[PDB]
């Protein structure tokens, strides 16, 4: 362990998008830094899935997010977006948060959104979402929330390598 | 020429902002690098307050901007004012200044500043980019109705957030982040 660093996917991502972006982000965070930053790949579906594993990276099944909370777009959303929330602002909280990152449609970045835009002003935060190009309002409220458009390994890799540059550039100050 | 990347705002208002962030997309871009990209702020302002340089780094004018473009159906559109024609005059300019360096292969990526003007202005040429380019605008805008600016592209709105305009606490924050975002695209592009 080390600074941390979480991809996180939805009820939306697909396995290999998810895997895609945290080798990308991983890789880039190596290649980017000038020698380190881990990769925590944490999934937040409200729907059962039949992987809990990412790889080779250290991960978080939607159990676990969730475990951690105590009890209006959906109840599901509702309740597993307050679970992550409260998920890293603990990690937060342990100053060893770098940034987040995760994916999702209008659902997924509903959920994301408000667990992200809870982080401080600063802390890298990116959504690769396919609500993008619409009424954000919403979602981005009035934080530095980055809606990256839609997934498209092109657009993977620039989030990923965006999401890398923020993340060392702001611990290699 | 070796691959090179813009900086580019209306520097009558905006020239702290301007040479900040370029000032962080150079650092990081050389600090990201493993080998050499350059950067060069644009000028696309269309007020009266003339601008010459931005520090020390490569620079052009918009008067430059200008002198590439020839006249076409811009002319003619609607206009509350004069002011606003030369925003869509420029606009265009823009298209056919940023399309002229990635015809010549010098274009590694773009990256802008702007309110709801800027953000126009630097949407319309930005997207008529291809997909894949890095092309960020930084928008107190991005926090609304994105349609208009970003329609079916990859361009990417980075809020504003906003302690004021000019440079201070968390304009700072989100200008590096920004900065920062923007050259890791760039170079993880280039060495990939």
Redesign the interface.
């Known amino acids: 362990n080390s600074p941390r660093v979480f991809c996180i996917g939805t009820a939306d991502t697909k396995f290999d998008e998810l895997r895609f972006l945290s080798e990308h982000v991983r890789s ?1 965070l190596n ?2 830094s ?1 020698k380190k930053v881990g990769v925590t790949v944490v999934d937040v579906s409200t729907s059962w899935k039949e992987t809990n594993s990412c790889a080779d990276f250290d991960f978080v099944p939607s159990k676990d997010v969730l475990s951690c909370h105590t009890l209006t777009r959906g109840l599901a959303i509702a309740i597993m977006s307050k679970a992550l929330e409260t998920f890293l602002s603990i990690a937060n909280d342990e100053q060893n948060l770098a940034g987040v990152i995760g994916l999702g449609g209008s659902g997924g970045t509903s959920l994301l959104s408000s667990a992200f835009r809870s982080l401080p ?2 802390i ?1 935060k990116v959504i690769i979402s396919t609500v ?6 919403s979602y ?10 839609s997934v498209s390994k ?2 993977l ?2 989030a ?7 993340v ?3 611990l ?1 100050s």
Request: hydrophobic share 40%; proline share 5%.
């Open positions: 880039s290649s980017f000038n002003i600063g890298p993008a190009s619409g009424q954000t309002e981005i409220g009035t934080s530095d929330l980055v809606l990256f458009p092109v657009v890799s620039n990923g390598a965006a999401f890398a540059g923020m060392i550039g702001r290699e």
